[PDB]
Design a protein around this ligand. Structure first.
Ligand SMILES: O=C(NCc1cccnc1)Nc1ccc(CNC(=O)c2ccc(CN3CCNCC3)cc2)cc1
Ligand SMILES: O=C(NCc1cccnc1)Nc1ccc(CNC(=O)c2ccc(CN3CCNCC3)cc2)cc1
Lengths: 466, 467
């Protein structure tokens, strides 16, 4: 990896654009105000450790960057002097300072989450050089926030229909590994989902957490054995019962997810599970149920049709909250077309049809880790303050056509209010310590990670009220 | 990186689920039938083969780590330590797998076999669908290359209708999506994918990917221009927008420069600062060094039309051979906000309706180009189609009653080009008859080694538009 080649091209030319005699460039990250009232701050420690800490500048990196950018711009615009400065004076270590809200902290929109400044006036251009690599934290932030929002829906509906929050941390399972853009995205996204839930099929996320965060538990996330269409359809169109029988017998002591929509989901629930192999199901443990998996059709209408069939072939109880509960050796998983909107649609339809949320689990692939953008939480990195000719000025943008794009002014700090809420203090006002100390702790300074958090601490901060 | 830890967790347990005495598992990848994305660009496999699948990908170390993790992950011992040990012993960690794919860059209609995977060792029947997760991640460069190519079709048609030539087409859609992607690796894969169709990028990560994985005759596959950002305008102070503008155009007077003009008032900046106050610094610039005014807010088409009507009333507007309004050669525009395949269509059309040539404008796209894409867009699917159990080869498939669109193909597959130039995917091993000529799929991977590679220039030629 080469940090000198890990920015937007045009940032190569910015050192020549700042006001002459600019000694400081101070920039901040925030989730700009536009549903998602509060964001989970997660993922920066990964970026600091993997990409910014230690000797990140070398003579070969400088040369390679210079050789690439000479052809890339068809002009020598690369600041070789500026980069050799960092190498000589600092031994390749970035003279930068990043103050940030503790990871896992739940902060409402329009608040400073982290700040960047150069610790050496010759590196005034370095602050916004590393914007690109830092802005990419929109991803773990958005995944963790969106995952926590679904956990709130799942908490509301499970508690309403059952009376408790038993098994909430397993109600949303990650199926996203294939539906993400890369192996790195898989690890980052999966880890961000694991801030709120304990179930994932994206193995990549476990190694990231082990490496960059750590948990007291040997693993941060768990899974169950499961079928796929290949394991079902490999038996032949005539032998779907055989497949179903084989699989449930091979995983008879553990919970097993069996995809039941390969030919006819309705017939598999009515004839194969409900009659032909009913004897194999009603014998299962509460600790090792059969999790029936539909995977096609309208997600809500399929879940209700599947519950109806099962409710007719298996004994259903009425729980303390007056809702229908399947036998404990039988559960359902919706893993198709699940995003925050369809999940909410399904749990509402279920409550309307007097079905408990104890009966269902949800699997989400693309909707959980892919169908997300930087615009969702309005993740913005902006220069709020500069020091030119020794004088500090408040910097900001205010486009005429978009008042949502009106960034903060001056040096910023985040403080806890006397009522336990959060407040972003602009223009150095925080130095007065009216609402106490600033919550933005120094995490990085001159090539060193100064403050780290374990995944156990992150999970603790991201907790719901309920 | 550990391939044993680079799969969907449930796949660890599938070796116990296939029919007993199964010697072969054969699977294929397609972009299932249903902006209508009628054809797809095949790109990105060679990257995956080289980065993650070739060579010794199994060690005693890799086996113990996977065994340890999964014991805890599953709270049971399901891991096929036996199966993985067999690859380490017999094949020196090389995967006894065979991948056949259509040449990269090839533009194939939807619902056609793009690639196939099968085991070369009967004992590794389970390995075919183990590597499914890593291979289906090919959806991403396939999808970025297709949607980028679809924007090129729009750009080609409008540049041809407004100017009568495609001069500058490969620079009309620039990649501004480096910060809007989910990771560094994605940035590189995504950028490279757009570079299959265009030569304009700011996502530097993709140059290194092309160089390392594909290669070009040209020293770099992508290019950029010096450009301002909000921090380099706003750092001068709210009252010194003019001073910021002046200093940037003076520092870059010999090269083209993109200047972000919306920091406070895009229209005032075009009318007063660019139009009056600094006009003398613009009208003086070279044809090879224009000022590219960048609006970056408000309604993308409305803003472009208003900014063009302002620049036309402050600078000398000529007329091209097709009768379309053309700004003077030292002045151009870049729309780099809210640009996706939909808004780009509206803008080129909106400008065409106002008799503005498309030579005037360039487009910039971030999230629209690199992130706001899902595996669902092209219905990228990997499915088992053929199995050999107890010596008998059987055509396997899925056909969900409530989704005929999820119906997979049967048996051994082959892709052919028909005499009329069309494309057919022959199911059930029918391609063995030599009716439609040679199968378009080639062995790209066999037993831990890359058997066929493509250069980035070959891909670029294959992905070229008809126009
Ligand atoms: O579908 C699955 N993979 C396919 C896939 C994978 C990847 C990509 N694409 C498709 N995997 C699966 C995973 C988790 C879940 C949720 N878990 C349950 O439903 C459940 C319920 C009750 C109990 C018993 N107990 C425990 C002790 N406490 C009381 C309850 C145990 C588990 C369901 C399915
Ligand atoms: O906006 C930009 N960065 C901001 C950013 C960056 C990253 C993230 N977010 C915002 N960069 C920018 C890049 C390319 C382009 C397209 N290029 C042109 O407009 C152009 C026009 C004419 C000529 C001269 N010609 C004469 C004949 N011979 C060939 C050259 C050369 C180039 C525009 C802008």
């Amino acid at each position: 990896f080469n940090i000198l080649l890990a920015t937007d091209s045009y940032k190569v030319t910015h050192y020549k654009q700042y006001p002459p005699n600019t000694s400081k460039v101070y920039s901040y990250f925030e989730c700009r105000e536009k549903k998602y009232e509060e964001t989970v701050f997660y993922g920066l420690q990964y970026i600091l450790n993997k990409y910014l800490k230690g000797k990140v500048v070398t003579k070969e990196k400088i040369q390679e960057a210079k050789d690439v950018y000479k052809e890339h711009f068809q002009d020598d615009v690369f600041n070789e002097k500026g980069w050799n400065y960092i190498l000589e004076k600092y031994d390749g270590h970035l003279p930068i300072e990043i103050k940030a809200v503790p990871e896992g902290f739940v902060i409402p929109r329009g608040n400073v989450l982290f700040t960047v400044e150069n610790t050496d006036p010759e590196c005034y251009w370095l602050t916004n050089w590393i914007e690109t690599i830092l802005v990419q934290s929109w991803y773990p932030i958005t995944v963790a926030t969106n995952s926590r929002e679904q956990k709130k829906i799942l908490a509301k509906y499970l508690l309403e229909t059952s009376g408790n929050l038993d098994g909430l941390e397993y109600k949303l399972h990650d199926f996203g590994y294939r539906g993400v853009s890369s192996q790195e995205t898989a690890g980052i996204g999966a880890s961000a989902h694991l801030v709120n839930f304990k179930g994932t099929d994206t193995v990549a996320g476990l190694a990231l957490i082990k490496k960059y965060y750590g948990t007291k538990d040997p693993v941060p996330g768990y899974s169950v054995p499961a079928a796929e269409h290949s394991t079902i359809t490999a038996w032949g169109k005539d032998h779907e019962k055989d497949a179903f029988e084989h699989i449930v017998t091979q995983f008879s002591s553990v919970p097993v997810s069996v995809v039941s929509d390969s030919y006819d989901i309705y017939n598999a629930c009515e004839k194969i599970w409900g009659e032909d192999l009913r004897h194999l199901i009603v014998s299962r443990s509460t600790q090792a149920p059969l999790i029936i998996r539909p995977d096609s059709g309208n997600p809500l209408d399929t879940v209700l049709k599947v519950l109806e069939i099962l409710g007719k072939k298996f004994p259903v109880t009425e729980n303390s909250k007056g809702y229908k509960l399947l036998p404990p050796y039988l559960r359902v998983i919706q893993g198709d077309g699940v995003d925050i909107n369809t999940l909410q649609e399904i749990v509402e339809g279920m409550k309307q049809k007097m079905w408990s949320i104890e009966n269902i689990a949800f699997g989400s692939g693309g909707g959980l880790l892919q169908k997300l953008t930087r615009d969702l939480l309005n993740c913005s990195f902006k220069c709020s303050y500069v020091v030119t000719n020794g004088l500090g000025i408040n910097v900001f943008k205010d486009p005429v056509a978009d008042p949502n794009k009106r960034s903060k002014k001056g040096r910023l700090s985040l403080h806890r209010t006397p009522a336990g809420n959060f407040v972003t203090l602009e223009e150095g006002k925080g130095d007065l310590e009216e609402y106490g100390q600033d919550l933005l702790h120094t995490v990085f300074k001159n090539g060193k990670v100064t403050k780290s958090y374990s995944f156990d601490e992150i999970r603790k901060n991201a907790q719901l009220n309920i």
